[PDB]
Design an enzyme around this catalytic site. Structure first.
Site, PDB file in Angstrom:
ATOM      1  N   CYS B   1       0.794  -1.278  -0.424  1.00 45.33           N
ATOM      2  CA  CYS B   1       0.255  -0.500   0.376  1.00 45.33           C
ATOM      3  C   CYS B   1       1.236   1.194   0.248  1.00 45.33           C
ATOM      4  CB  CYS B   1      -0.667   0.129   0.911  1.00 45.33           C
ATOM      5  SG  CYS B   1      -1.985   1.736   1.317  1.00 45.33           S
ATOM      6  N   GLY B   2       1.093   2.030  -1.667  1.00 44.90           N
ATOM      7  CA  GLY B   2       1.592   2.963  -0.847  1.00 44.90           C
ATOM      8  C   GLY B   2       2.052   3.671  -2.640  1.00 44.90           C
ATOM      9  N   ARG B  31       3.632  -3.550   4.191  1.00 47.76           N
ATOM     10  CA  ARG B  31       2.280  -2.752   4.759  1.00 47.76           C
ATOM     11  C   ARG B  31       1.637  -3.705   3.694  1.00 47.76           C
ATOM     12  NH1 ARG B  31       3.092   3.041   5.211  1.00 47.76           N
ATOM     13  NH2 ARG B  31       1.099   3.526   3.892  1.00 47.76           N
ATOM     14  N   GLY B  32       1.711  -4.842   2.843  1.00 56.79           N
ATOM     15  CA  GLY B  32       0.784  -5.004   2.102  1.00 56.79           C
ATOM     16  C   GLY B  32       0.413  -6.468   2.659  1.00 56.79           C
TER      17      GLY B  32
END
Ligand SMILES: Cc1cc2nc3c(=O)[nH]c(=O)nc-3n(C[C@H](O)[C@H](O)[C@H](O)COP(=O)(O)O)c2cc1C
Ligand code: F3S
Lengths: 1472, 81
Positions: B1-2, B31-32
């Site tokens: 995510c980003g 983050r994934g």
């Protein structure tokens, strides 16, 4: 695979019909596609009446009040993955039902069980729901059904508007319901437990199971459909949809009203043929007509010009054929209106359909006569359905109408005879047309200048024009096509060379035409299209022509009749217009056509008559394509016709493509001018001009029928404007814009290239001072002509390299052949690696590579015995395999010669004629081969001239010496993929050690066919190209049919890899393989084995004389003389050396490439690149569709299994475990078993063991006998040898006694049967197909095509159907009953006796090649007497016994039928 | 995510920006949504400039002539079944 229907005759609901329907569905598992999973099916379904009490009790339980009227229940498939799609669809349905005023009772979730579904049928499983709608407005039933249908259509349109996917409606009606899915047939009552209830009673039931060709199931594609159920597979849908697109723009009916507006695109998107046919049928039924009338209007009968029907049916069929275009193709239909229940057959009657009436007022019909268990003490009549027949049941009054009764009852509603008289013909008009006003002939110089403008050479007039006007038939060539393809060539190739024709592999049978020419019609009607939902006399007032091709006088008479309503259009463009003149001309003509049609014109004549030195001619094909497409897209094609005057039409392939594009009539005036000019010079002899024109027209029509029959279409009205062609080398834009439906997998030249070619030829013809036409080379090599693949120097250098046994000479040959400009598809690709070369001594040896080469089949009828034997000996010496091809083989060659040179062949073919196929012929091989279509002549049968048939070949093929032998185009055994699976099972049972190879021809759509045949347990596929040789074939089929194997091989490879099926089969290719580079390219494409063919003939001495059909080949390769066979020069060492050089070239290329084995390179497409010919040609060929790489993943890129694919065991297994004393002591035996329709090929493996042990004729007749009690399966006793006696009590399904090889079969009803043995069908269709010996006695009537290709068998049956004894060759057949039309058609040997009470044989027989008389010799009387006595002895019949009682007065009731060729050769003459 | 973006201020093409973009993408795995499979993702992507020389050399190799102006390259997802 199969349809079926059960109906209560009286019309009272009961649970019995539903439970019997479920029972019938539980017993069709043998025909389906068995899978290793056991849970994965391909579609199944049932269609029953609505159980009112069930849903009313449900509503009562919910809390509402049960209404008085009937209920309405709709079954819907909603998406399952989302929760807005479900809600959106529910909202749409609810606001669309309530807009009419009906009351919704609620939704219900159907109980299901997902325990039985596999994986890939579960990832796309939809959410099944039901909606209960009640009628509160008190409307009638018909109105209620009409509004329900309108609501369904509007819901479909609204849901499609939001592009909401995964949505479907399986039914919405107040009368019937449909339960269907993607499960197995036997697991239907487990997935849907609702059908196990006690309240599901009905008065009718339809059930269906399908056999799909791919392995990706889609739930909305399972039958039965709403008011239809179809078995078979329709041919013409690309033409019928296009005509519906024109019929929609005028149809309207007061029953619908304004709502009509929302049914305009009646045929939606995402449907199959069985869906579009169903939609049209439902629309036509819901507007007033009844199911029988619609069935007659869509799938009509064959209108023949014979006196065997009352004129009432003829008038009715004329009306029906005039109002609508037929929907041809193999079709067994079981449809139902709200009142009627109909079961019907198509025109040719290909699929089987058998029914039965019981004393319970119950009729059961289906594809097999043993599905439902019923004792013979309950039956009343057994029957069948002939071609075009139908059987109906009226539930409202409870009656049963057979064929004739239904026809008489249907021909009474309207006065058809008084209506049909409005038709007007043209021969009347051309006879009233006076012999005045004919213009003067054109000048010779003008004719030559116009002919040069189109590129016509003198070889187009001496080779393919002279035989037409001289003989009445077309030209003949005898070698493959080595000419370059149209785009890569450099001369002026007409636009009609870019269109390859179409044909039908296993999925559809081609229609033979030299025998069933009575069912093919060429009628043309002008002023025909109109409202299809009407009934009045104005619908049959039009002009009718007998053939779409018109002469000049006929064209002028028709132009007289047209006159003051027609509009002519110019089709020429100025040469000096500039770089964009052709496009502007197209624009202009397609605008003027529309502007003139809107002005009241009803006839458009598109002429290039004004072609001059400043105006070039638009190619007629492009013009008519643009005009027809624009008229279809503007809703105006329904108004006018389309007549074309062309100046290039000279061959039968022009008219075919013109009528396929959309033209109505075609006039070729330049060809007639050339005919007249050639006649005035005294070249034809003493025949008049009118006779020549008549012969030319007859030849053109025969060739048109031939082209139309390669695909399976028997009427021209449904073939016109369908586009049954493929363009290879045209731009995707041009084709997709101007032509209705054709695929260009590789784009080509656009409009600029066509304009350049046309302008170049026009300038060369009109500015250059011509004096004579060039000789031209297209069929024969000429220095001034076109380039060829086989020239002189190449052949000489190859023969020298082979005979001197030197490799450097062969590399010189390779360098000569690999340096010409590109001529085929495989010339533009380029090999390119990224690794480092490895030495030559490291790659595989020559042995392991030479064992990958084989030689294709070449019949003994074409080749000489010496060359055939030489090939067989040479190919077995190096360890490879040879081929025997059609025409059988010599039994005496079945043992090695004394030099060890074995003359046998490791591959045996099963041709379409079965000319020598016996039980020993199939047990003396290692590897079998089924031949569906040949590379040179696809969709056609091999030929053999009448003087090529010596006595040796006549004995080897069991035929008559000095008779032309033409094989039947279809197979009569393979009418669909289920029959192919049946035949493969038969072949794998008769020979327990061999493999089964299927041979196809490259074309588009072959991928799905290949994925289908791979599920039928076939383990080797063979893909031939268009450039393969032949023994004798028409020139049009040689030059204008097929596709290069580069396309088909890659397509089959990709499709097989996509379906996870590549690891089970092998791929083999041939056609035009000459060098090692070609073999390496083919191996990269996906093939594993390679066939060579014609190159072998050059190694033995053939020098491409192209006179194989004349029986005068100088060297003596394809010859049957003695003078010329003495000139043979062949030797096996030549062929061995050729193969050695060819294999070591592959070794060289591989070692230079960077690999060490062919398994390293197979399938590796990324080693090939594409380079084009340069920036001076600009052909936009993109071979990327050809170079796409589909990733396998886990599996390899070739076959990885050992041995063949075994199949389940039939009853034969038990027999082999029981008749051990016969195989050990060799003693007599006697066995008794119980048969069932789920047991195929009973008594075939036993025949194999007997053949291997004793041989075909080693046991006395009746050594081992078996007694079966019950309805047996299919292929009963196929390939049975002498010494085996099967006795069935009951009936047989189909293909009984296929290929009988000396055995004995007896079929009789049970002893407790209350049936007249001479009035009930006992055996099905295609009985005794290609039998050579034995006997068969039946006590009933047979089906269609009884005793086709009989060679030595003897049969006595109490009846027959249509097409009986078709193309018979030898034996005797006694028929104690009636026969059908086209009886004894193509018969060329044997004898027949018919027992005539009705004295109506001269009305049914085909008095073309046989003569019929009365018995006048006692020698032929003893024969009949003994045959009937043997019949009475075996079957204990009562009809034949009573005939034998009164012999003196019944002997004079028999007709004797004898062929015409057997009038000298009979030994006791028939006359006095 | 980003999300992320890299830009050369002066405005001259170079391989550095692309390799740094790949390096930045290689380090957002914490983050994934980690999965027991290890192969199943939920979406990823990069957006860069058109490599004119690459496709021009491709066209040259095919057999055409490399034009003077810039090229246009369209990326399409077609059905596979
Ligand atoms: C003289 C001759 C006879 C042939 N006979 C048959 C045949 O009986 N059955 C068949 O399936 N193919 C027959 N073929 C076609 C071959 O099986 C094969 O498809 C063809 O020779 C391949 O062409 P090629 O040599 O250019 O590679 C024959 C071909 C020739 C030239
Ligand atoms: S073309 Fe035919 S006639 Fe003999 S020489 Fe060759 S096989």
């Amino acid at each position: 695979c199969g349809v079926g229907f059960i109906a209560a005759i009286d019309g009272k609901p009961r649970r019995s019909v539903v439970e019997k329907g479920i029972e019938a569905l539980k017993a069709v598992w043998h025909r389906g596609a068995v899978d290793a999973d056991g849970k994965t099916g391909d579609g199944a379904g049932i269609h029953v009446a609505v159980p009112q009490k069930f849903f009313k009790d449900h509503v009562k339980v919910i809390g509402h009040r049960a209404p008085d009227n009937k209920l309405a229940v709709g079954q819907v498939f909603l998406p399952r993955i989302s929760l807005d799609a479900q809600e959106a669809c529910r909202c749409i349905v609810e606001t669309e039902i309530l807009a009419f005023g009906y009351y919704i009772y609620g939704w219900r979730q159907v109980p299901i069980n997902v325990d039985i579904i596999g994986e890939k049928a579960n990832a796309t499983r939809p959410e099944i729901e039901q909606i209960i709608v009640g009628n509160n407005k008190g409307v009638s039933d018909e109105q209620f059904e009409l509004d329900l249908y309108i609501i369904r259509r509007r819901i479909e349109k609204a849901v499609k508007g939001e592009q909401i996917n995964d949505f479907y409606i399986c039914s919405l009606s107040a009368r019937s319901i449909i339960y269907k899915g993607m499960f197995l047939a036997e697991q239907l009552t487990t997935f849907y437990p609702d059908l196990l209830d006690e309240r599901f009673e009905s008065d009718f039931a339809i059930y269906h199971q399908r056999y799909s060709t791919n392995t990706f199931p889609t739930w909305p594609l399972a039958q039965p459909f709403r008011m239809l159920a179809h078995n078979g597979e329709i041919n013409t849908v690309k033409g019928n949809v296009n005509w519906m697109k024109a019929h929609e723009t005028r149809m309207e009916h007061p029953a619908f009203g304004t709502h009509m507006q929302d049914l305009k695109p009646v045929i939606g998107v995402g449907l199959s043929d069985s869906g579009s046919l169903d939609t049209v049928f439902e629309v036509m039924v819901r507007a007033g007509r009844t199911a029988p009338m619609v069935k007659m209007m869509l799938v009509p009968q064959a209108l023949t010009s014979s006196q065997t029907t009352p004129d009432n049916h003829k008038a009715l069929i004329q009306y029906c054929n005039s109002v609508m275009e037929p929907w041809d193709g193999p079709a067994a239909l079981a449809m139902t209106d709200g009142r009627w229940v109909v079961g019907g057959m198509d025109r040719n009657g290909l699929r089987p359909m058998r029914y039965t009436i019981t004393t319970d007022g119950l009729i059961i019909g289906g594809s097999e006569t043993g599905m439902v268990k019923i004792d013979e003490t309950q039956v009343i009549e057994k029957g069948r359905l002939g071609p075009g027949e139908m059987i109906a049941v009226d539930l409202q009054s409870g009656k049963l109408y057979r064929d004739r009764e239904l026809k008489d009852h249907l021909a009474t509603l309207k006065p058809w005879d008084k209506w049909v008289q409005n038709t007007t013909h043209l021969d009347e008009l051309v006879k009233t047309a006076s012999l005045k006003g004919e213009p003067s002939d054109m000048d010779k110089a003008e004719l030559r200048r116009r002919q040069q403008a189109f590129g016509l050479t003198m070889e187009d007039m001496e080779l393919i024009l002279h035989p037409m006007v001289e003989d009445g038939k077309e030209a003949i060539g005898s070698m493959g096509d080595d000419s370059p393809i149209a785009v890569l060539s450099d001369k002026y190739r007409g636009l009609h060379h870019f269109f390859r024709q179409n044909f039908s592999q296993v999925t559809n049978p081609p229609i033979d035409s030299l025998r069933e020419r009575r069912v093919m019609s060429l009628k043309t009607r002008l002023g025909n299209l109109g409202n299809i939902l009407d009934e009045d006399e104005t619908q049959t007032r039009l002009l009718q022509l007998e053939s779409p091709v018109l002469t000049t006088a006929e064209f002028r008479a028709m132009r007289d009749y047209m006159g003051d309503t027609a509009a002519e259009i110019d089709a020429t463009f100025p040469v000096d217009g500039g770089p964009e003149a052709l496009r502007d001309a197209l624009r202009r003509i397609r605008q003027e056509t529309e502007d003139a049609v809107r002005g009241g014109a009803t006839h458009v004549i598109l002429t290039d008559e004004a072609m001059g030195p400043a105006r070039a001619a638009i190619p007629a094909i492009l013009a008519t394509g643009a005009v027809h497409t624009h008229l279809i897209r503007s809703n105006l094609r329904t108004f006018t016709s389309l007549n074309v005057r062309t100046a290039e039409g000279l061959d039968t392939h022009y008219f075919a493509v013109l009528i396929g594009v959309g033209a109505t009539t075609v006039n070729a005036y330049l060809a007639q001018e050339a005919i007249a000019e050639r006649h005035r010079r005294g070249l034809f002899g003493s025949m008049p001009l009118e006779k020549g024109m008549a012969n030319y027209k007859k030849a053109i029509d025969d060739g048109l029928l031939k082209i139309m029959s390669k695909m399976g279409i028997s009427v021209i009205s449904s073939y016109r404007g369908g586009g049954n062609f493929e363009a290879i080398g045209l731009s995707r834009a041009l084709v997709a814009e101007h032509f209705p439906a054709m695929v260009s997998r590789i784009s080509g030249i656009g409009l600029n290239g066509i304009q350049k070619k046309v302008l170049e030829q026009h300038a060369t013809a009109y500015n250059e001072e011509v004096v004579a036409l060039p000789v031209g080379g297209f069929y024969r090599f000429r220095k001034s002509g076109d380039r060829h693949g086989w020239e002189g120097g190449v052949i000489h250098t190859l023969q020298q390299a082979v005979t001197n046994d030197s490799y450097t000479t062969f590399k010189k040959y390779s360098e000569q052949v690999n340096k010409r400009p590109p001529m085929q598809l495989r010339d533009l690709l380029e090999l390119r690696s990224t690794k480092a070369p490895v030495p030559v001594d490291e790659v595989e040896s020559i042995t392991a590579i030479r064992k990958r080469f084989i030689t294709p089949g070449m019949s003994m009828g074409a080749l000489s015995p010496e060359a055939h034997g030489t090939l067989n000996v040479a190919m077995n010496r190096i360890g490879a395999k040879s081929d025997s091809g059609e025409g059988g083989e010599d039994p005496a060659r079945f043992r090695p010669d004394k030099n060890g040179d074995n003359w046998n062949s490791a591959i045996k073919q099963v041709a379409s004629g079965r000319f020598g196929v016996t039980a020993e012929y199939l047990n003396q091989c290692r590897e079998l081969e089924i031949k569906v279509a040949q590379g040179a002549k696809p969709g056609e049968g091999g030929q053999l001239p009448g003087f090529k048939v010596t006595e040796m070949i006549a004995r080897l093929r069991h035929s008559t010496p000095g008779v032309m032998l033409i094989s039947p185009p279809p197979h009569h055994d393979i009418y669909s993929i289920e029959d192919l699976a049946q035949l493969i099972y038969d072949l794998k049972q008769i020979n327990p050690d061999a493999k089964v190879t299927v041979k196809l021809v490259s074309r588009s759509g072959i991928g799905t066919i290949a994925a289908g045949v791979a599920k039928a347990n076939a383990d080797i596929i063979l893909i031939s190209g268009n450039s393969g040789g032949t023994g004798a074939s028409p020139q049009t089929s040689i030059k204008f049919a097929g596709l290069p194997w580069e396309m088909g091989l890659s397509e089959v490879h990709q499709v097989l890899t996509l379906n996870r099926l590549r690891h089970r089969v092998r791929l083999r290719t041939d056609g035009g393989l000459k060098t090692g580079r070609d073999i390496v390219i083919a191996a990269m494409l996906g093939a594993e084995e390679f066939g060579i063919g014609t190159a072998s003939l050059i190694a033995m001495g053939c020098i491409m004389v192209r006179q194989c059909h004349s029986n005068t080949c100088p060297v003596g390769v394809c010859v049957q003389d003695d003078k010329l066979r003495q000139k043979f020069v062949g030797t096996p060492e030549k062929v061995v050396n050729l193969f050695t050089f060819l294999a070591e070239e592959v070794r060289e290329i591989l070692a230079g490439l960077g690999f060490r084995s062919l398994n390293e390179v197979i399938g590796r497409t990324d080693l090939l690149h594409q380079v084009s010919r340069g920036a001076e040609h600009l052909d936009d060929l993109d071979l990327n569709p050809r170079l796409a790489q589909v990733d396998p993943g886990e599996n390899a890129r070739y076959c990885t299994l050992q041995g063949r694919n075994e199949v389940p065991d039939t009853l034969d297994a038990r027999i082999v475990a029981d008749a051990r004393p016969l195989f050990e002591e060799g003693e007599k035996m006697q066995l008794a078993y119980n048969a069932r329709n789920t047991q195929r090929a009973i008594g075939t493996r036993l025949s194999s063991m007997v053949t291997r042990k004793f041989g075909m004729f080693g046991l006395q007749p009746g050594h081992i006998t078996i007694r079966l009690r019950g309805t047996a399966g299919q292929s009963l006793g196929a390939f049975a040898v002498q010494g085996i006696k099967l006795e069935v009590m009951g009936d047989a399904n189909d293909y009984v006694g296929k290929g009988l090889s000396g055995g004995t079969i007896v079929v009789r009803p049970t002893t407790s049967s209350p049936l007249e043995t001479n009035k009930n069908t006992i055996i099905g269709n295609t009985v005794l197909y290609g039998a050579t010996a034995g006997k068969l006695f039946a006590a009933g009537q047979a089906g269609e095509r009884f005793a086709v290709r009989n060679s030595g068998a003897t049969v006595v049956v109490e009846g027959c159907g249509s097409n009986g004894c078709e193309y018979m060759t030898g034996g005797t057949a006694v028929i104690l009953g009636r026969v059908g039309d086209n009886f004894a058609a193509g018969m060329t040997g044997g004898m027949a006796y018919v027992y005539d009470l009705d004295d109506s044989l001269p009305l049914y027989i085909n008095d073309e090649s046989v003569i019929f008389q009365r018995i006048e010799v006692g020698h032929y009387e003893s024969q009949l007497k003994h045959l009937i006595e043997e019949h009475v002895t075996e079957t204990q019949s009562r009809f034949a016994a009573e005939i034998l009682n009164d012999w003196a007065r019944e002997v004079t009731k028999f007709w004797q039928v004898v062929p015409k060729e057997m009038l000298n050769r009979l030994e006791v003459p028939v006359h006095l």
